[PDB]
Amino acid sequence: VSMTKTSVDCTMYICGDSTECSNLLLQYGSFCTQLKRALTGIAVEQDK
Amino acid sequence: KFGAISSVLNDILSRLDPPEAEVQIDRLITGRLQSLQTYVTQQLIRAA
Amino acid sequence: KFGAISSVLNDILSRLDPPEAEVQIDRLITGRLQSLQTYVTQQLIRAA
Amino acid sequence: QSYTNSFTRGVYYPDKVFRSSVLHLTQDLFLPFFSNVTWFHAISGTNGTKRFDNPVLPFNDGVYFASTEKSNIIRGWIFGTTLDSKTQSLLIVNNATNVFIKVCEFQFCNDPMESESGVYSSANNCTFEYVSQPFLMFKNLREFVFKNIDGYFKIYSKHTPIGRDFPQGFSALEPLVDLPIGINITRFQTLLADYYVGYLQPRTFLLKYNENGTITDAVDCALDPLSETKCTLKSFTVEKGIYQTSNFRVQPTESIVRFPNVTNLCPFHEVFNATRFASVYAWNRTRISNCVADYSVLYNFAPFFAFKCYGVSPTKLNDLCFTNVYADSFVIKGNEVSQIAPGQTGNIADYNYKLPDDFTGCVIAWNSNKLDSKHSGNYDYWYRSFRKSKLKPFERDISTEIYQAGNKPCKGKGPNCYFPLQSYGFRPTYGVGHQPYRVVVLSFELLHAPATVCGPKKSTNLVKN
Amino acid sequence: YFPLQSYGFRPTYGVGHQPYRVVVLSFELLHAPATVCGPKKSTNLVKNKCVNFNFNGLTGTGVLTKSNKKFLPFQQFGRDIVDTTDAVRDPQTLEI
Amino acid sequence: ATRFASVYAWNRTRISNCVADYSVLYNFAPFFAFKCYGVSPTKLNDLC
Ligand SMILES: *[C@@H]1O[C@H](CO)[C@@H](O[C@@H]2O[C@H](CO)[C@@H](O)[C@H](O)[C@H]2NC(C)=O)[C@H](O)[C@H]1NC(C)=O
Ligand SMILES: *[C@@H]1O[C@H](CO)[C@@H](O)[C@H](O)[C@H]1NC(C)=O
Ligand SMILES: *[C@@H]1O[C@H](CO)[C@@H](O)[C@H](O)[C@H]1NC(C)=O
Ligand SMILES: *[C@@H]1O[C@H](CO)[C@@H](O)[C@H](O)[C@H]1NC(C)=O
Ligand SMILES: *[C@@H]1O[C@H](CO)[C@@H](O)[C@H](O)[C@H]1NC(C)=O
Ligand SMILES: *[C@@H]1O[C@H](CO)[C@@H](O)[C@H](O)[C@H]1NC(C)=O
């Protein structure tokens, strides 16, 4: 009926505790936001 | 490592000057971002 | 070619010594990784 | 006083792009909302310290100024570093009819009653002048933002009808001037013939544009969780529900540095300051262990022909620990320095000393002509010009067999064979390409810290939990 | 020996002797943003046709038409909701 | 060659129906530069 719900913080996974890496990651646009939306949608779908 | 000299960002920043750290970090950013997109894609398929 | 001088790994290894051959090979690896990942992702959707 | 709430003050147009009925989320240097703004009525208000002294304030990344004065008592600013004619500085002074902006080497100004003032003192070596750029610049709040980005000095300003001190409200500062000053601005000073200063920090703001391109409101994404939610959604209206915002982390409170009891210094002095150096053929490898990797002595010892590090680009080698350190010492010709690197070829790289293609370490080349050259020629250095095969990385080949040039055995030297070791003398009369140079390659293996060759750092007390 | 003797003002006709004015230009090209650069030629404005354009460094391809947008005095160009340029201020006439 | 051509008139010599051995190139001089594109030096002793 349901799947384990997860949420992944893009910045911590790719650039954990790294300011320079985070600043570089900002140059790739909305990708982190798109993954956050995808995982949120999955979590809501599992509760539905 | 995804082609980088080290998998640990703190070693890249402590070992290399910014102009080289940006290259090694960019390689790691590409690898980790690809890993998250692959994960999210499989989770969307499993969610369906 | 995905940006490489040649699509054939044997030609890259024959023509260049490791310091650049590894770079040209890394580009061919990256391109083929994207090709295989796209193929499998679409096969998973089609299989569903 | 000397602090104030500030409210929603100090927003400026981050760029020159027209937008219509959109919300634009941007990261730039802004004065945070409800941050503390320094009020200088105390200390340097009214007469204040005028005619005797005045403190100088820091310029950290950029500044926000405000004043409610209409008397034009406040006349200008100086931006720069030393501000004593030693270096360049930028001086902006207002007048009744014009504006005088000059960047030159300024020593001091007549402006640190008021029948005559501002004749200035002395200046020289001036670089740029700008005159009447904006021509001019019931109380009037006069807001300014001064920002220095990649050599461009950006000035923004706004006049708001005001008698309240920073009344509640919102007004964006339009850009006023953009100067190619090209200098370094670490400190600034005000000039008097009431005044507020806020400091900008990098922050993300959501700016609301109307149909006519004017910014009418803004959200400071870090002010409170509601503002952060608004920025996440890029809306000034938030629907009922739960929204996910940025993750939280617990920050560290102190730095813990732990090193072994070793206080011995690595013997770089003895290897680099040796009175006699090995040839390239019998190049000398000394292992460095159980010592402090202090490289300050290397920069103090002498200037070098080349100091090129592969895999560790900085000269700041004192912050790393090593697991396997070797110093390979040899004497080469200047024209061969370029051959001692991964991927290089030639008689030295091919037959006397070769680095691995994944080499990590530093190649240090010092001009040693005054020590190694001789009038008769120093024949104690002997490259192997002729070898049957190419040398392997870090291989030491000390064979003395006579090389035979092909099929003929040619035992002995001459008819079709050469003794592989070829002497070439060094003499004070040779040019820089032939003069002897001492090269030491420091091979650094970096694989975490199983073993210690750590640099000159101090240990602190251990703190747990 | 003095540098102040007149040397070559007198014609003293020879190819060697005739004075020549020599002016040299350093072309320093320092790090600080350059304020000196040659004049950039402009070309007549074409509207209601598909053209390539370069407006004060902003380049693109499109059809230029009279706009009803009202830019603030300092704004040089505009962008739509997805940050793609959709309007410019002509650097010579200030028409939007 | 005793004489090299001026840069306005580079001398193009065609080499064909021959075999190459590159140790002679090292024998001719110490070099200011020997930069190869698309192939690394010392790999030219294969078909080049
Ligand atoms: C310089 O720019 C100004 C406006 O910024 C131009 O002035 C107008 O030019 C048009 C056409 O030439 C005239 O019809 C207007 O009457 C002018 N305005 C004024 C106030 O004189 C000017 O022509 C431009 N100069 C050049 C050489 O292109
Ligand atoms: C600013 O300071 C740096 C410090 O290294 C210096 O290199 C640079 O030239 C300075 N720029 C100026 C004074 O414009
Ligand atoms: C925008 O400008 C037009 C110009 O006619 C004016 O009518 C309108 O009221 C203005 N709107 C705002 C919000 O300033
Ligand atoms: C180090 O070099 C100096 C010359 O700069 C010399 O006087 C001194 O004796 C040398 N020390 C050793 C141990 O070689
Ligand atoms: C190499 O250096 C060490 C340093 O102590 C020295 O003892 C050794 O004799 C040297 N060997 C040669 C061949 O120079
Ligand atoms: C170019 O080299 C060839 C080699 O055979 C020679 O015959 C020819 O004359 C040369 N031309 C010039 C202009 O040097």
CA gap D282, D382 in Å, rounded: 9
CA gap D368, D275 in Å, rounded: 11
Chains A and F touch (3+ CB pairs under 8 A): no
Phi, psi at residue F25, to the nearest 5°?
A: -65, -35
Helices A31-47, B18-47: crossing angle, 10 deg rounding: 30
Distance F7 CA to ligand 6 centre (A): 14
CA gap A43, D422 in Å, rounded: 76
Chains in touch with A (≥3 Cβ pairs < 8 A): B, D
CA gap E13, D308 in Å, rounded: 59
From the list D11, D17, D15, D5, the residue with the least C-alpha distance to D219 is: D11
CA gap C17, C38 in Å, rounded: 31
CA gap D377, D429 in Å, rounded: 10
Could you tell me if F46 lies within 8 Å of chain C, comparing CB atoms?
yes
In D334-381, the DSSP E strands lie at: 361-367
Atom 4 of ligand 6, nearest CA residue: F13
- Between the alpha carbon of residue D158 and those of residues B28, B35, D167, D407, the distances in Å are 45, 48, 15, 91
CA gap B29, B42 in Å, rounded: 20
Contact between chains at F39 and C16 (C-beta distance less than 8 A):
yes
Is the CB of residue D333 less than 8 Å from the CB of residue D434? Answer: yes
From the list D14, D59, D58, D11, the residue with the least C-alpha distance to D34 is: D11
Is the CB of residue D417 less than 8 Å from the CB of residue D402? Answer: yes
CA gap D148, D126 in Å, rounded: 20
**Torsion, Cα of D423, D425, D431, D434 (10° steps):** 20
- Distance, C-alpha E60 to centroid of its chain: 19
Candidates A1, A10, A17, A18: best to mutate against B (most CBs of B within 10 A) is A18
User: Shortest Cα distance from C37 to chain B (angstroms)?
Assistant: 8
* DSSP secondary structure of C1-48: -TTSS-S-HHHHHHHS-HHHHHHHHHHHHHHHHHHHHHHHHHHHHHH-
CA gap D172, D216 in Å, rounded: 7
Chains B and D touch (3+ CB pairs under 8 A): yes
User: Shortest Cα distance from F21 to chain D (angstroms)?
Assistant: 15
Contact between chains at F34 and D345 (C-beta distance less than 8 A):
yes
Residues on chain B touching D314 (C-beta within 8 angstroms) = 15-17
CA gap B10, D191 in Å, rounded: 46
Q: How many CA atoms lie within 13 A of D428 on its CB side?
A: 5
Nearest bound ligand to the CA of residue E92: 1
* DSSP secondary structure of B1-45: -TTSS-S-HHHHHHHS-HHHHHHHHHHHHHHHHHHHHHHHHHHHH
SS3 of residue E57 by DSSP? coil
Distance B30 CA to ligand 3 centre (A): 47
Burial of D396 (0-12, 13-18, 19+ CB in 10 A): middle
Which one of D184, D186, D187 would you pick to mutate in the ligand 2 pocket, going by the greatest count of ligand atoms within 8 A of its CB?
Answer: D184
Distance E73 CA to ligand 3 centre (A): 14
- Dihedral of CA D131/D134/D138/D139: which sign? negative
From the list D313, D397, D414, D297, the residue with the least C-alpha distance to D363 is: D313
Is the CB of residue D11 less than 8 Å from the CB of residue D205? Answer: yes
Residues on chain F touching C13 (C-beta within 8 angstroms) = none
Give resolution in angstroms. Answer: 2.9
